Structures are given as C-alpha cells and as structure tokens.
Amino acid sequence: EPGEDQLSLLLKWRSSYIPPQKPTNEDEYKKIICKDISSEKLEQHAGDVSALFINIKWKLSEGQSGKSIEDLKKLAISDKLINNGIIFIWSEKEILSQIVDVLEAKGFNYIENFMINQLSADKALEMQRKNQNIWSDITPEQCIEQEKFPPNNYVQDIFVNSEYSFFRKSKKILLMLRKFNKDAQLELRHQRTSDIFFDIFEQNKPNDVSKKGMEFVYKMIETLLPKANYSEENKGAFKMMELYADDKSQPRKGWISVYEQE
Amino acid sequence: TLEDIENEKFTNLEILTHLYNLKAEIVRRLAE
C-alpha cells in the first residue's frame, strides 16, 4: 500500500519544506561579495551575529578541490563578529579532531550533532529493476525533482556508500559549536527538530544536499534561534551570517551572505 | 500482591521465597 513503505514514509517531511522565492526587497539581506574569506575581515561587514553557518567544502584527497584546515585556521573570528552564538560547520570523519581543536582554539565548544542520512536515488532504481524485473527508466535525478520515489521496505541497502579505506561513508555531519557568553543570555527553543532526518542523494554527488534538505537545515537554524529571524528591529543588524555562500539558496530574509570570488 | 509477583519477570527462586514469606506472614497473622 502507498504511504506505508519505509522509503515513502521516511521522506514524508519533504511535502512541508518547500523552499521560498528569492526576496525581492533589498533591505532583507546583505549579499557581500569578497575575494578571500579567510583573509577577509568580517567584523567590518557584520555586527553581533547569533548564527554563523560555514558552508565549507573540504579538500581531503590530492585531486579533490576544496578548502583545508589551514584555510580554517586563517579565517578570523573575534568577539565583534560573534560573541554569543552558534557555529554550524560541515565536518568530515578524516578531520573531525583537527576541526574541533582549531575551533576550541577560538573559544567555541562542542554542543550537539545534526546529520543527514544519505539515501541513493541511483540504488533505488537499481534495486527496483533488480527486484521487479515502466516508469523506472527515466533519470535518477528527475525522480528527485518530481518526488516520484520507488517503494522500499528495507532502507539499509539503499544507503550511499562512498569509497573509503575503512567503514564506508554513509552520512553527512553538521557540527554545532557554541560560544558561551557570560553576561548575555542567548534565546533558544529546545527540542523543535530531531537531530536526524533522511534525505535523497546522488551516488555521484554525495556532498550536494538537496534544496529541500537545505531548507530543512535553514528552518532548523531559524527555529532554534527565534530572535535572529527577520523583523523590523533587525533591519541593518542581521544576526544570521553565511560563509562560503552559494547562489542556490542563500539570498534569504534576515541572512548575511559572504561569497568567495564571484 | 501474589498475582503481581507470580506474573512478574521474577525468576523461579525469588518467586518461591516471596511466596514463602507471604505464606509465613499470613499464617502468623492468622494464628495470632
């Protein structure tokens, strides 16, 4: 029966997290364009920020393009930029200890973990063709866009399992690190989102979260901190910042975007 | 409650000693 299988029942959240349109009004975002974020002095651009989301793409192999731990060390975070807030940074298994060491070097302590279980849209079609054998021959990506997913009552065989020298990679980890201020107190909203949700992916693109998944992450950040959202008193004093932003979903109401070499 | 301890997940020896303690207490309070 439809709606009762494991795959169609684990991806039920996607019907409510539709990403919104781009904000047309100019006074709802910042949209900073720079050359080198690590060399950039962000304290001039933005004031007290309650949520700093670092959308960093790590370099881990010799030929893989991305940023490194040295680039994270060169990045400057001070009390002017963020004195009481939370850092959301994409972590990896290979450099987790280095990431937490360099971030505790800047006064940020580990608090929580929020991860995305990777599900393969390629393996879904492969398993459907393996088990059943007319709509299964279209594209592993149009099924992501049209949300027409094949039934699956055992999801453990659909995981994206990328190559590794150890246990195969099947998750994406978003670390949360909070700068505990002393005099001030930061507004929270406890237990509004689970620290786990399943999301579809591509076998060839394990490090590209979907638009609805990024919407889920953004709404998790915005629900966690309610006074950092866009309002009348937050005009010119936006309390949400992005590092290494992209034009895909970042122009947003109440969000400061910092781009890299546009 | 005897029906509680009999249907509990207790092993067959703790059930047995609870039953013996209950029997001893009720026979003592019956005789005296």
Binding site: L96, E112, S170 | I15, I26
Partner: protein, 224 residues
C-alpha cells in the same frame, strides 16, 4: 476468616507449582543443556580498576603469539559509573600494537572521548552511528537540550601498521539503523561489522555485558 485460609490454600498450590518448575529447571540444568553464551567466549569477572592487565598480556602472548586487534569499549560515564580519570589512566596503549578501538561515546562525552583516544596513541579515522528505529519503521526520536536525540555514536581510532592482509578495507557502513532493544544494549550489527573488518581476529571488550558475549571475544565486566 475462612477467606484467609483459602488464600493460604492458593499460596500452597502456587508454592507447589513453582517448586515443581524449579525442580524441573534444576534437573534439566544438571543434564545436557547449554545457555545462550557461546562455548568459545572468554568472560572475565573483574573490575577494571582492580584487574591486573599484565596477567592478561602474558596469557594472550602465550596462547596466541600476538596481541589484540579490536578493543571495543562502552564506559559508564559519571553523567556502577566511574570517573574519567580512571578511564584515561587505563593501560590500553599496552594492550595493542596494530589495531582499532571502539569507544561508544555519548553526546555529553564526545570531545573528552576524542581527546582520550588521541591521548592513548590512536588517530581518529572513522565514526559509526546507530540510528534508532521503531516497529513501524520510523525513527525513534527522544529528547535533549538543543535537538531531539535519536542517535548513538561510536568513535574509532587506529594504530600501528594496520594495512596488511589481516584487516579489510571498504567494508560495511557507518550507519546502523536498528531497533532499540534491552535497557542499554548495542545492536549485534556492530559485532558483525567488526567481524567484517578483522576476520578471525583476537578481540577485547571492556565493560562487557552478559547480553553481548560472543564466540571470538575476550570480555571483561563486573556483572559478567
């Protein structure tokens, strides 16, 4: 009253029935009957603070000719439980040359666990997470401070010259999606993944439980 005498009669029949069941079980035990524990398991009943590890090292070197390969652990954190000083002062760096370690940290004891396994001499190379499940097939969500906790994390270190014909690469998965069973009982899929990693190896399990005794594992615990 006579109702109390009837209750005495009922408890007499219950005593006789359970006496017969006890006699049946103890007669079957003193006969051919085996428990759920495998015959090749090595359980050790000792507290780790009082356990002499040197005798274990001598016995392992005598009867195997090498040392351990996996030292899977699940420490009782203070947050019976023991302090982090005793866990950090444990002789793990003397119990292995070339192998892995599994620690099963909690959310409140994540960074200190990372520091602990980097202080023992290991390098953090991998992470295994257990996502809890329900009977229907959904995620068994819980509670927490910032987010609803529905995960359990295992941190994996490495040591020495692992890359040989002993250990295998590109096996299993980091995510264990299985139901929550027992009180604090980790799923058997982590043991299957360990056996996929090092086939036919020597393993050690600190703070082990009677529910997780296995047919290739040396297991140390207090209630074991």
């Amino acid at each position: 009253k006579k109702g109390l005498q009837g209750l005495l009669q009922d408890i007499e029949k219950r005593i006789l029935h359970y006496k017969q069941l006890f006699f049946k079980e103890q007669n079957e035990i003193a006969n051919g009957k085996r428990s759920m524990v495998p015959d090749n398991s090595i359980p050790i009943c000792s507290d780790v603070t009082k356990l002499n590890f040197q005798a274990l090292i001598d016995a392992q070197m005598r009867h195997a000719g090498k040392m351990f390969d996996v030292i899977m652990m699940d420490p009782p954190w203070q947050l019976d439980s023991l302090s982090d000083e005793k866990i950090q002062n444990m002789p793990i760096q003397s119990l292995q040359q070339d192998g892995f370690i599994f620690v099963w940290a909690i959310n409140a004891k994540y960074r200190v666990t990372i520091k602990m396994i980097e202080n023992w001499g290991y390098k953090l190379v991998d992470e295994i997470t257990w996502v809890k499940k329900t009977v229907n097939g959904k995620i068994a969500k819980g509670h927490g401070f910032y987010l609803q906790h529905a995960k359990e994390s295992c941190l994996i270190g490495v040591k020495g010259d692992v890359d040989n014909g002993r250990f295998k690469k590109n096996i299993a998965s980091d995510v264990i999606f299985s139901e929550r069973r027992g009180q604090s009982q980790k799923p058997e899929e982590i043991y299957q993944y360990i056996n996929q990693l090092c086939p036919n190896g020597n393993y050690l399990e600190i703070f082990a439980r009677r529910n997780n005794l296995h047919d290739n594992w040396v297991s140390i615990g207090n209630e074991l």
